[PDB]
């Protein structure tokens, strides 16, 4: 049966440019603003996240929430020569919906997908893909998920002094758990950039947390 997210990804198959991550996304946005909402950060946040990739360049970004990969292609697009993006996604009909948007856009060379709950793959990074730590983390999965994630990040050694972490949804829906944390903790360097709600003209906000240690 038919879903939003099949929807969307035959509007770009039909609509956009094979291999041109701009047209990729200006056609998501498009469909989205024009027929359908979807819950992509969309083009106003977007331009926040483009900024934060630009200024810090990243080699290895974590995200958390792929959807139909609107984000995904979003950074991947603006990634360095050699730089990868992992992104984790708990439902496979998603998760195979990305693979085909990254796939017309031509940057499934720059991201790998992880096929399950972060809480389960996070604490298998280390062993199973070869990470380090972690440059970068968008958390953009479901808002109860962000505290405990970013908590366990911390536990399992993925992160190191600088790593960014930004987060979506800070104000809508609203994540009041984790701003509480990184706000209430030294270990994290804090800035708040107002925005929109994806599609419409609410605000909300993306909350960027620096990593600087124990
Ligand atoms: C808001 S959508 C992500 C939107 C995407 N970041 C974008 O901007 O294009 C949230 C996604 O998180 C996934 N998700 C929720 N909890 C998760 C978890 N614990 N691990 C992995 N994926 C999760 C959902 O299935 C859903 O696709
Ligand atoms: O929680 C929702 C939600 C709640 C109710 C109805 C539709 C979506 C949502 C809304 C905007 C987002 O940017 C986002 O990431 C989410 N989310 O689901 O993770
Ligand atoms: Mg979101």
Known sequence: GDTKEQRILRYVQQNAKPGDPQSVLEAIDTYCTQKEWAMNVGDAKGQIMDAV?????????????????????????????????????MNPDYAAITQQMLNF????????????????????????????????????????????????????????????????????????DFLAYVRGSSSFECTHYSSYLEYMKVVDGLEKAIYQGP
């Not at 995200?63 to 050699?82: H, I, K, N």
């Not at 856009?105 to 990074?125: E, R």
Request: net charge neutral; charged share 25%; hydrophobic share 40%.
């Open 105 to 176: 856009a031509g940057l499934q060379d720059k991201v790998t997908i992880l096929n399950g709950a972060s809480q389960d793959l996070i604490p298998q990074l280390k062993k199973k893909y070869d990470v380090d730590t972690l440059d970068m983390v968008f958390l953009d999965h479901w808002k109860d998920r962000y505290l405990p994630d970013t908590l366990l990040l911390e536990k399992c050694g993925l992160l190191r002094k600088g790593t960014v972490l930004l987060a979506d949804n800070v104000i809508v829906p609203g994540t009041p």
């Open 53 to 89: 990739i630009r200024e810090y360049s990243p080699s290895l970004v974590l995200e958390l929430g792929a959807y139909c990969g609107y984000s995904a292609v979003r950074m991947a697009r603006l990634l360095q020569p050699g730089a990868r993006l992992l992104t984790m996604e």
